[PDB]
Structures are given as C-alpha cells and as structure tokens.
Design a protein around this nucleic acid. Structure first.
Lengths: 262, 177, 206, 143
RNA sequence: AUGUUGGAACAAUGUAGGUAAGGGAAGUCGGCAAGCCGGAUCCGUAACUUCGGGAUAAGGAUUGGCUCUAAGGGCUCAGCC
RNA sequence: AAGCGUUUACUUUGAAAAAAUUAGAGUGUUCAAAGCAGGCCGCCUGGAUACCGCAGCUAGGAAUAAUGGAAUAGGACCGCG
RNA sequence: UACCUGGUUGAUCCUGCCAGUAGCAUAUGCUUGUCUCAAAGAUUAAGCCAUGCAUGUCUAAGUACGCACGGCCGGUACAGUGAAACUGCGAAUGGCUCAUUAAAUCAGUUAUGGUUCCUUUGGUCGCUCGACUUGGAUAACUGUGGUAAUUCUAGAGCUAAUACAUGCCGACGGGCGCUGACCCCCUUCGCGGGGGGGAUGCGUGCAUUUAUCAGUGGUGACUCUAGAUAACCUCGGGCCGAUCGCACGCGGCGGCGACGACCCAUUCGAACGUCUGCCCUAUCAACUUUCGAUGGUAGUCGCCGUGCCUACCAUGGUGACCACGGGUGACGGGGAAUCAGGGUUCGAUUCCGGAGAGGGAGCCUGAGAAACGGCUACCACAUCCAAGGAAGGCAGCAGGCG
C-alpha cells in the first residue's frame, strides 16, 4: 500500500463483534483512540447491534450528536469510538450506566452498573516513566499519563481511578491469590485467582490462574488483568462470572431452562 | 502566449512553473507544469502591450486621464482605518468605517458595512482573560500536586526506614542465637 | 535517484536477485554534503517524517572540548591535517566525523590564564601589552588565595599538549556528524590519543 | 598488539585522559544467565561488535551450532543441522544452514568442531546477524 | 664540400615527392599503383585443428603538460644514503 | 514460597494461536439450498464447540534412537596451608 | 459404499495397455413451464479505446463590503441566508488486474534496546528576567484583453485571515549559584588556621549538539530514563495562543466550547531482520569478485541496523543435503474438486499480504507516493489544428473494436 488503512471489510471484522455477513460488505472501521482496533467495540455497534435502539447507520449518527452518550466522563460524538475494556458509557436520558465487561465467552457482555459504581474504573498500568524533572509517570491501558502516582505501584498493577477528577483512589498489588480477569486469547473472559507465576527471561512470562470452580488454567501475563484482592472483586460481576464450564452442561442448562418453565 | 517577467529573451520558451510563478495557476498542492512563455524584450512579434503611465503629461487624453474610476472596496482592518484618517491609538475607529449606500429598484434603500478585523472587543478581552485563568490554573495545580506528592513522599519515607530498622534488629537478633 | 536498497545486489551465495518493483521513496539516498572551511553556509533539507536535516557546506567554528579540565569553548577551525577514511579528504579539506583538524589556541589559553592564571604559550622575552591577564594573575583576596593556591596541585600539563599551545594550533578530532545536524563539534586530542596521529602525521610527511 | 589501522580505535564510553596525580576498561553483563568471560574483563582487545565490550544488545532467539570455518577475521561461519518432516513419505531429510556468526576475540581458544552457542541481535553486516555467546568444547579432545 | 662544371630563367612533356570538394573500384585482364592500419597500456578474441595453434584473430577504450599521493631498497627502533 | 540441578529426537499437556471456508450445537427460511435468529404472556435467551498440522515457546516422562563422562587422570568429594 | 467390464488366442492362464464407468469444471448442440440463491471479458490481447460517470468537502464557532436573496431596532460594524474565492482537510482510501516475481512475494513465530508517524486519546506547554493585539500583500469584484483552442491566462485599482512574517506588558517579587567589592569573630608575637555574611552583575523553561562525572525508577541485558558541570541555540533560526462562537454574573475577573501548535506516552500504520516452509530441470557442477563478491576498520548517505555507498585492508562466501543457471501455460496463502486409508490436480477470482496503471526513468507536494481519475522527459500508439501550436492514457463502472 501507500498509506494507512481507512476501510474495514465485514469478513475481516473480529469474531466477538458478532456482526452478520449478509447485511453489508464493509464493517464499521473503529477510529483511533486509547484502545486498539481488534479488542475494542465501536459505539455504533454498542448502540445499533448490541442495544438495538438504532436500526441504520444514519440513526446512530443523530443519537450520538444529541450529546446523550457520555463515555467514561467525557462526551464523544464519534460513532466509531474505540470503547475498550470497562469504559463507563453513561447515558443521562434514562439514568442508565454501562461498563463494558467481558462475558464467559469472548464477547463483550451488556452489563448495567449502578450510578455510584459509575464514578470509578480499574486501569492496568504499563510502565513507570520518569519525567523531565524527576517526575514519576504511569501509563494505563487507556493511555492515561498520570503524573505523581503512588510510588509503590509497579509495572503490572492496577489502579482504581476516579472519573470526575481523573485521579487514582487505590491500587491492587500483583500477588498470588488475588482475583484476575483474562483479557485475551482462548481463555478470554475468565475470572479466577492467581495461583502460580512462572518466570521466562527473554520470552513472555506465563501465570497459572485457578478458577473459582477449581478449573486451573494458564495464561501469559500480557493477557492478564487483576480485579481485586483474594476472593473479593472491586466491581460488579455479570451472570456466569467467567467460569467457562464445559459445553456438556450448557447443553444441560439450556435444556433444563426450557422444560422447567414450559 | 503571455510573456514572463525576467526571462532575458525575445522569442518563446517553455519553463517549469510552480506556485508563486507568473502565468501559471496550480490546482494540486505543489503542482508543477511546463508553460510556454514569450520573451521579455519587446519586438515586432507582439500583439498586445500592457502599458502603465507613471507620470501624467501636460496634455490630457480623453480616454484615461478624464475617466475617474474610484476605489472598489473600503479599508477593512482596524489598524488600516487609523492610518487612513491619521487617528491615534486611543480613540474609537468604528464610526470612521468606509460604508457605501445601496440603491436599486425592487429593494428598499439599504446600507452595507464591512466587518472591522483585528479590533479590540470585550469578547476578545474576555478570551484573553480566559487563557490567563488557565495559567493560574496550571501553576496552582503543579504546586498543589507536587506538594501533595512531596508530602506523600515524606509519608512513605517514615514507613520505609522504620521497616529498615526491623531487618537490622533482626540481623543482630538472628546472630545472637 | 541514487537509492539505498538491498535487493539490487547479489545473494550471500552469489546469485543475482531479480527486482519485483521499481524504486521506492523510503529507499532514498541523497548526495553528500562535503562541508569545507568557510563562513557558515548550511542548507536545511526535509527528511522522512516531516523533520529537518542540516546539510552543512561551509563551516568555520566548532564547540570542541578539553576533557581533562572539564571545559569546552567555541573556537575557529583553520586547517585539516589528517582523515582516517580517505587521503583525498585531506588534500580537498573536507570535514566529516572523525577528522583531525587544527584550531586556534586563544579560547583555551585564556581559560588557563583566567581560572588558573599561569603562563601557557608565551615564549619568554615578550610580556602582555594589554595587561589584562597580568591584572588577573595578581590582586587576589587573602581568603581566596589559599583556594587559588590549591588550584596549582593540578596545574600541570603534558609536554605534547603544551607544545601545540606554543604555536597556537591545536590538533582536535571531529565528534559530531556535520552533514546531518549542521554542527562541527568535537574534542581535543590528549595523551595516548594525541601521540597516535603524531606518528601518523609524521608518516604522512616522511 | 592493537591499533593497527588508519584511525584510533578505543572504547567510546570511557575517558582515558583524566588528570593523574592501566585503563578503566568498559564491560557489561549480557543476561539470560550467561556468565561474562574472564578474558573480556582483563584483556586488552577492543571491538565495537563484542557482546561485552561493544554496543550490541542480545535479543530474540538463541541458537547453537558447530563451527566449520575460521579463515575470516573477527567473524566465523557455523553449521546447523536439522531434519525436515515430509508428510507424504513418513521420513526426514538432512538439511543444513550455514550462517555467518561474529566471533568476539574474548573467546581465545576456539577450535573447528566446537559446539558454539549464538545469540540474535541487530544485523552487523550484509549476512551477519548472530554473535557468539559461549564456546562449549568439542567432544573429547583432551590433548 | 654536395660527388667528372657554373649562371639566368620556372614553358610543355618528363623522373622523384605531395594535396584534392562529392562518389568510393563504376577504371583495369586483374584493387596495378596509390591509399587505410601501425608503438605501448587495459578489455576482448570466432570457425577449424594434427590441441601445439589460429592470435597482435576480429572488435573496443586510453595516450600531452603540470601539481601531488601511495607502493616496491641498503648502512647503524629512528636517522642517513 | 523462590532458584539451581546432561542435552535432544519422541510422547503427553498448556498458551499463543485472522476471519471466511471445513466438521459440528441450537434454530420449522412452511421444507431445503440458505441465514443467524428467534419464542412467550417487557422477559428469556443465542450468535457454541473442534483443529490450525509442518515451524517456534513452555511444562510431566525416561522405554526406544542419538552424544558425552576418569585409564599420560588438569578425576570427583572433605578439611586445608 | 474400500467395486469393476469388454478387447491379443483354435480354446486356457498371465503380464500388458486400449476402450468403457462415475465425479468436477470450460465451451458447445438440442430443448425448457414455476420459484429461491448465485457466477459472469481470468485463460488468446497487463491489446487499443469513441462517449458518459467514478473525490470532493462548512459548522452557532477561519475569512461575508457579491443586494445574489432578504429583517428594520440601526448609525454601536457585520440582522440572517448566501454563489464565488482565499484558507484547512481528504485526495497515498476504495476499485480493477495478476504482467513481473521461485527463501523472492507469501504463510506460521519473534524483534525494532535498529526506526519514523496523519489522526485519536491522556498528559505537559506565567517556570525563560526583557501588548486593550504589529505589519503589508493577495484572491472574489470593476475594467482592458490575447490565442482557433485548453480546467490557457496577461495588465491596471483594490479589499480580509485559524494564509504570510513579527513580537511583548505580565507571571516577575524575587530565589539558586559564580565573580565576589568589603566587613565581622575566635586564636596565634607575627604571617597563618577555622567560622561566616556580603553590594554589583552574569547564567538560570523546555528543545539541538559536544565533552566529563556519581546511581529516583525499570528492563534478561543500556552507552535507558532521571541528576550534576562546561559550553552550543542551526538566520536555508524549535516552541513558549498577536484565533473564533454561545449564555453573560460580580478596576477587572468568571461558565460552556471549537480551533491552534512545541514535547511525551497511546492508537494507527510503514520498514527492515530472526527460525522453518516453495514447481520442474544435470543435454545446467561449479558459482560469486577487486564494475562489492564475503568479512574488518573509519566515515558518507539514509528515519535508523547494514558494502547501502565510499576509502584502506584480509581472501574470503555458497555448493552434490543440488549451489549457480534455465524454464515456469508460477502473484502466494487461507482454501476448491476428489478420495476407505493414504494421495493427485487446481487456486486469475470477493479475506489477508505483494506488484501496476502502455513500457521504462526522474521528481513536486504531503505524515504517508517514486502516486499516474499528479507532474517531468524518451519510446510505441492515438487526437484537434488556422500548420503557428495544444492535448491523452478504461488491468476504475458501463460501453465499443480486436
């Protein structure tokens, strides 16, 4: 090519968006922002395809510019905004707040959070950066360059930031036994405690995660995101709670739900 | 074919012309194109000569020295109003605008006036007063958060060195057993 | 134009590559700067990413450094004596990185005569007529004289470095790359570094 | 011994002409559990492409092979043998790839047939992209 | 002392040397005669062959002057020839 | 709890492993090719799952197939001067 | 469903091939009532193209004196629309085709600690010691025109910037050091030792470059980031608001914004490498090189690593495990047909990545092109001409010829 890509094919869209292929040849190309293209979910998909308020793309265009959608403390009027992990999309008209949390599968789950829960979110830091005048810096998953952080926050800890002020409240130390959120891969959407850390110099470190039901599994540290200390989470949890119980009993639960109600 | 300023010939030549060159109208940004231009020295191979009379002679031609074609537009910028009427830098120049009367059939007699550019208005002064609030906001915020961090850096300092004395006391206690 | 491409030449084993595309814009190469001695004539050129590179063509001064005394000063370059890459860059006096050039000594000599205030250069027989350094040699405070007298513990200089101070022409090596940033900074040859090219310059003369 | 070229080769990081009244030789660790050799620390070789006294960083894959040629100066040629599985005929085939690996002169006694351990880094030359990390002695060869 | 004499003229035919616009062997039994190439350095060199040759095959480039640089040695590491 | 403990091929496991396509779960497009929906007097839900060989990483095993140990001992341990 | 049949003989059993048998396209012949999906100028010609269309774009918030419309509460300037034009952005995406190309593209895996970055997001940007807003061009317009003719423009009056250059009051009242006038105290016969203060000026924001020195925070490992000293501040100079719109509440301050930039991370690309994988061919066995061939040193250039290139050196590097070379009716892969099991054939073709716009070559702008629905030349084809000159690239959707 001779420059950056601007279009996006419907076939080339990621599988967790669950967009049907019979509608259009193209897919909503996400705009650049604090999250990457693949694991984010555009605001047009969250409204038209997830919540079904809107039918067509022009209908999404009008609603976003009525200034009724407030993503994580700032109103964005772009239909293809890269809404990443746990962006607190707050809707003022109906008094309803959405935080983008993964389901037990790889898809984003439509999770309604309480308004007092909407003021804070958990961000995973990436590096401790020294500024031009001996200024410590932290860079979160959504590229929040927070100067003067708490000095005990390390490379892969998570900070409970506050949305209306843009500053942190607490932080969770990366240690074994703490709760975790597997953000990526085949174990995408899993919730479990951390049981073992394996060191690999040069290569990628892999961390074993014990599930709440005792289904221990491994995951590299790049797709690992702690969510709380011990067995106590710091946010609300969707139904399923990230277990990935095997497909033999989703056959059982789906069959039992139909016959019980009739 | 138009003739080009400073080409030092009398015939016709072809030249690459970019933006800023005469006898060329670019369409794309940085567009370059060859243009056939005539020489600058005038000979008997010309059709039309554009002539500009600098000093008027004592004789009066009926075509040009008699026909008065006035200005087309009035001065628009605020500072250019001051130099036209030899005003000062303190008085108001808004009433000294060069406006024109408008009269034609089918419409009422109206009057149109230009917008005075680069004129001091309370909106710009408020905007100037708005950006100095950000400078007061910035300088206070850097001093507030650095002092909070310096207090925070003192907060961690008492606990870090207190726990240092636990290892040193352990280093003596383990060696005593 | 002249390009920087690896696919235009042979394989490791010796086979010949066959091109599958024409010349790309990111493989671009430009003609050399080849800056000389003269008044400052530096041409700025736009490079990849919308940045600027300073193509120097004539340079006269440079911020050379004297690292033993932890001092650096701007001095005018006069001559080019040695270049390790090619001998035609000495005859045609061209400045590139790692060139042995000649500079005047007065910017560094006055610093020795101000901060230490001792006679360097100054072949015996003639005294300073402006009398400014003579004033600076004497007339110290009594309490600062002891601090001044402790400056003479390290006021010794090597004979080879002192020898080029006699004629006023110091050998110095270019450290900055001139055709890119436009400057001609560097450092003065000292000790083992200085005595190496003195053998080579003598070998150049014979 | 050293300095046999047109220019003056030296370690760029250190300064060797400070005011006086040996050389403060620069050397760095390499990582991945690799122990820096004694000869690099105490020797007088200077080379910009040495993994310990030069400005090269070891990253990426770590491989191993057998040295076959040493007529080249400051760089050597190693041999790596492997078998490629063909899915049609359930057999293999002997295939070799002889890449060029830089040999820092810190490793002094290196013989043809020694099993060398290399490390990936930035491309040193047109074909050289690997540098010697340790030299394991060949099998036997007590004499 | 110009080959067993000199001086003055500069006609044709001569003998011996040369030069010729355009064509380039159409001249002539017949390229007869005349003409082209030419030394040296760096490339390159065919068919055939008795493998030794053909071969300086054929066909290309360069050559001046001046100012420098590098390399190739003897006598006690530097100096001197 | 952390680290080191002959190396592989081989075997088992885990991660990383675009979609579309392939096999395959559910779904009366009236059937089917298809498609991802849909059903109940706002709710209930789905849009699974499988491999990705061959190549590369990590973790259990020590049968088979390789290489090597000390016999001019610069051999292995224990204190050492 | 893992399957056979006929044919050599006077007749037999074999080997053996030929021909039947069933799939899958490609074309073609005959014929055809309904409905739902769906391919369709790839194979020979990446051959040539008449004509039509395919990339343009304004919000309350960059310029509004075009009555071209239009409100009257005007003299406190433009009510408010509004063609045009200056400016900003996109035009480097998408679409078509598969000509070139055989460790090359490409596929799996890793690295950029070897790099550049539009846009978006989050942070910085009174820190520097000297203005209630600087300047003059120009487009639109009036008017003179030329050429057969261009999306050709020439001249004369003008008139604006979120176009172009320029730059400060303030924060700013003082702090830190270095020159350090000069002064004070103790002790010593006495020079001498120590404790200190100190007018004055200079330098002191980040950014670029050179030299030197100790370890706030990390990496598997830095010559990392930060810190200190000494200077430098690219005139073909790095910034540090000389913008616009809505409510407006109290000498001047406040709320909601858009735009604008320096720098850092972020998204996004692009680019080189790392290990493995590719059709046939020996009537291709030696190939590569001082015209770079493989390495070392020092430099140039490049966004950076690098013989990418240059200068000086060594003679090196690949190959019978098929190097090199030739052909390819070869863009590669995910995949398609077909099979019990294994395999065979195909993949121009919707997704990814590469290449191109008739064949080369070179370049302007732009962050990103060696762009061709951009230019500059040559080659081949083709167009109008007044014979002076001008102008083109459908392997973009149609469509026409071959």
């Amino acid at each position: 090519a001779r420059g950056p890509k601007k279009h996006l094919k419907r076939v080339a869209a990621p599988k967790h968006w669950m967009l049907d292929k019979l509608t259009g040849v193209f897919a909503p190309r996400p705009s650049t922002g604090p999250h990457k293209l693949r694991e984010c979910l555009p605001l047009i998909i969250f409204l038209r395809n997830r919540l079904k308020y809107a039918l067509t793309g022009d209908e999404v265009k009008k609603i976003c510019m009525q200034r009724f959608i407030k993503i994580d403390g700032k109103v964005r009027t772009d239909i293809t905004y890269p809404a990443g992990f746990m962006d607190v999309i707050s809707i003022d008209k109906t008094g309803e707040n959405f935080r983008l949390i993964y389901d037990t599968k790889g898809r984003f789950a439509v999770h309604r959070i309480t308004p007092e829960e909407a003021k804070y979110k958990l961000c995973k830091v990436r590096k401790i950066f020294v500024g031009t005048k001996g200024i410590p810096h932290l860079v979160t998953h959504d590229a929040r360059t927070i100067r003067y952080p708490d000095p005990l926050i390390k490379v892969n800890d998570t900070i409970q930031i506050d949305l209306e002020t843009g500053k942190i409240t607490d932080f969770i130390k990366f240690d074994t036994g703490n709760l975790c959120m597997v953000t990526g891969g085949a174990n995408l959407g899993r919730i479990g405690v951390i049981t073992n850390r394996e060191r690999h110099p040069g290569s990628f470190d892999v961390v074993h995660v014990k599930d709440a039901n005792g289904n221990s599994f491994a995951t590299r540290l790049s797709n690992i995101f702690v969510i709380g200390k011990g067995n106590k989470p710091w946010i609300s949890l969707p139904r399923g709670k990230g277990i990935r119980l095997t497909i033999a009993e989703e056959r059982d639960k789906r069959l039992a739900a139909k016959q019980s109600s009739g | 074919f138009p003739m080009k300023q400073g080409v030092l010939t009398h015939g016709r030549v072809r030249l690459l012309l970019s933006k800023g060159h005469s006898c060329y109208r670019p369409r794309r940004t940085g567009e370059r194109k060859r243009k056939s231009v005539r020489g600058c020295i005038v000979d008997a191979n010309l059709s039309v000569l554009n002539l500009v009379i600098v000093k008027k002679g004592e004789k009066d031609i009926p075509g040009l020295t008699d026909t008065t074609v006035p200005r087309r537009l009035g001065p628009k910028r605020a500072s250019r109003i001051r130099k036209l009427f030899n005003l000062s830098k303190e008085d108001d120049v808004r009433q000294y605008v060069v406006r024109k009367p408008l009269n034609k059939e089918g419409k009422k007699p109206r009057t149109k006036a230009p917008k005075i550019q680069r004129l001091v208005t309370p909106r710009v002064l408020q905007h100037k007063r708005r950006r100095i609030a950000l400078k007061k906001q910035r300088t206070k915020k850097n001093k507030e958060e650095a002092a909070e961090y310096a207090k925070l850096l003192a907060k961690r300092m008492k606990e870090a060195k207190e726990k240092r004395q636990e290892q040193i006391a352990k280093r003596r206690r383990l060696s005593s057993l | 134009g002249i390009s920087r491409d690896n696919w235009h030449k042979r394989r490791k084993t010796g086979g010949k590559r066959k091109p599958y595309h024409k010349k790309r814009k990111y493989e671009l190469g430009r003609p050399a700067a080849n800056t000389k001695i003269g008044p400052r004539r530096i041409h700025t050129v736009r490079v990849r990413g919308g940045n600027k590179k300073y193509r120097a063509l004539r340079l006269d001064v440079g911020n050379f450094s004297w690292g033993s005394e932890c001092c650096t000063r701007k001095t005018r370059i006069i001559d080019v004596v040695y270049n390790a890459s090619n001998n035609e860059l000495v005859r045609t006096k061209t400045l590139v990185k790692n060139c042995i050039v000649l500079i005047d000594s007065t910017p560094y000599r006055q610093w020795y005569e101000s901060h230490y205030a001792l006679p360097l250069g100054r072949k015996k027989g003639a005294k300073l007529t402006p009398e400014e350094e003579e004033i600076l040699n004497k007339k110290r405070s009594k309490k600062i004289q002891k601090k001044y007298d402790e400056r003479k513990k390290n006021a010794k200089i090597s004979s080879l470095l002192e020898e080029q101070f006699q004629q006023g022409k110091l050998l110095a090596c270019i450290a900055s790359r001139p055709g890119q940033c436009g400057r001609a900074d560097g450092y003065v040859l000292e000790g083992k570094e200085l005595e190496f090219y003195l053998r080579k310059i003598k070998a150049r003369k014979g | 011994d050293i300095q046999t070229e047109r220019a003056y080769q030296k370690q760029p990081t250190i300064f060797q002409n400070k005011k006086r009244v040996k050389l403060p030789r620069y050397y760095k660790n390499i990582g991945l559990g690799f122990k820096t050799p004694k000869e690099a620390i105490e020797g007088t070789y200077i080379d910009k492409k040495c993994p310990f006294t030069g400005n090269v960083s070891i990253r990426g894959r770590i491989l191993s092979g057998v040295v076959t040629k040493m007529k080249m100066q400051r760089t050597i040629v190693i041999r790596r043998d492997y078998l490629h599985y063909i899915r049609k005929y359930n057999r293999f085939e002997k295939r070799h790839k002889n890449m060029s690996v830089h040999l820092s002169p810190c490793f002094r006694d290196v013989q043809i047939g020694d099993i060398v351990t290399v490390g990936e880094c930035r491309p040193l030359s047109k074909t050289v992209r690997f540098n010697v990390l340790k030299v394991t002695k060949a099998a036997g060869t007590k004499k």
